[PDB]
């Protein structure tokens, strides 16, 4: 199995510069897929950006069409996004996708379509047709027939993660990250609750593992608080049985990467 | 924004079935070839439907779409509680490569179990405290419905000066978690002979307690 797309880029961008995005596709059963972009900003509701299809032709919406660049470079199975002068009315999740887009002819109502006629042949170069002059139609001219009008249809099948992208002025500021144990509140628990504190940082997002994803099971990790510092704060914790643990933290603004032992002693 | 109308909210009941409208013109709904997403925040979408009523892979016979002229519905039948989530519709918009999204619908299923919160409460570190601050983390989870509130204690005392607490946050399990910081100095810290972090919850608090003689 199945396509699996994930978007890569700047989790922070100035004002005024250009936003680049790398979309990579692995797993499709298929030389090529066509892929298009969506934004979600906060608060806001999915907004389409454009699409590159198979046969390299792009399309874009229109409001956003003359700040907007997708290409393609299928022998590493990636599309590219370029949205120039960015703002903060930028910042959003950014999703590549998969997509289907098709034009379809459209009938009136008592209008066939194909090249299947029914004892009647010739009727595949028409659009819209019936054969109701009473008989067997045998050639195009025996059917009554419409020109169609053509029925857009665009739809997403497979959707990336998602890359959350602030478009700001502001500082990066890397965490701190700080081991933490309920041990001293029962030191007679069955089991220990550890944890890290990713202290004051900017901005959004970090990523939190714990034992380089061995551990996953019993792992809580807690959305960030925007505290007085103007800096973020968030925890994770899991509780183990009463064997090394550490917390892996990345901020990828600030390219920093913690890898913080947590002492599971109680 | 959004440019087809649906409600900001809809609720229904556990087991029961519930729908969500969809409205848009005559060049995009109208047309057909409706699409149907589903999402939970802070994670990628599903697709549901597409071409108005067909099911995407994968996708259970639960969800199923119809459309009538410009306004197309989407309707959840045997509601769990995993189909708490935002959902939006889409079409095409004059092109097959330009689509319009509507503006959104949080499902609520109502009738689910209450459930109190587990609470962690967390002292400060030694590396927090050698740099002259003391950082309390109390970390909330496991809760239903999402509403709690958190007070601080230190020696009988109410302490809200450098409190900051999260809103709730729906996890996977339709269960709420949130976190409270306490923000002090090592002095207030070590002044003390025990805090606590009381959350309430339903009218039934809990709490956990941390003495700076035991922790530090």
Known sequence: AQVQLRESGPSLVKPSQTLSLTCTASGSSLSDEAVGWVRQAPGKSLEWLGSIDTGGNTGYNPNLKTRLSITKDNSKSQVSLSMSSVTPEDSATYFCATVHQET????????????????????????????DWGGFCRASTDYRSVTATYTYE???????????????????????????????????????????????????????????????????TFPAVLQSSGLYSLSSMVTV????????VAHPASSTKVDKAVDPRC | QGVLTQPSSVSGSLGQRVSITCSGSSSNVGRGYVSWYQMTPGSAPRTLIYGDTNRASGVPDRFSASRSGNTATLTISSLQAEDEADYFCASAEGSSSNAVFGSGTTLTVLGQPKSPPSVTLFPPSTEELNGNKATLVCLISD???????????????????????????????????????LSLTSSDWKSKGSYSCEVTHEGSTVTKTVKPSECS
């Open chain 2, 143 to 181: 809760f239903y419905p999402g509403s709690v509130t958190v007070v601080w204690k230190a020696d009988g005392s109410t302490i809200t000066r450098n409190v900051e607490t999260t809103r709730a946050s729906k996890q996977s399990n339709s269960k709420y978690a949130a976190s409270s910081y």
């Open chain 1, 104 to 131: 379809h002819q459209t009938c009136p109502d008592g209008y066939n379509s194909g090249d299947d006629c029914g004892g009647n042949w010739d009727c595949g170069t028409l659009d819209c047709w019936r054969c």
């Open chain 1, 241 to 248: 049985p009463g064997q090394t643990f550490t917390c892996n």
């Open chain 1, 154 to 220: 665009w739809y997403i099948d497979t959707w990336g993660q998602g890359l959350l992208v602030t478009v700001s002025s502001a500082s990066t500021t890397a965490p701190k990250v700080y081991p933490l144990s309920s041990c001293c509140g029962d030191k007679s628990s069955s089991t220990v609750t550890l944890g890290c504190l990713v202290s004051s940082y900017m901005p959004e997002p970090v990523t939190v593992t714990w034992n380089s994803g061995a551990l996953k099971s019993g792992v809580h």
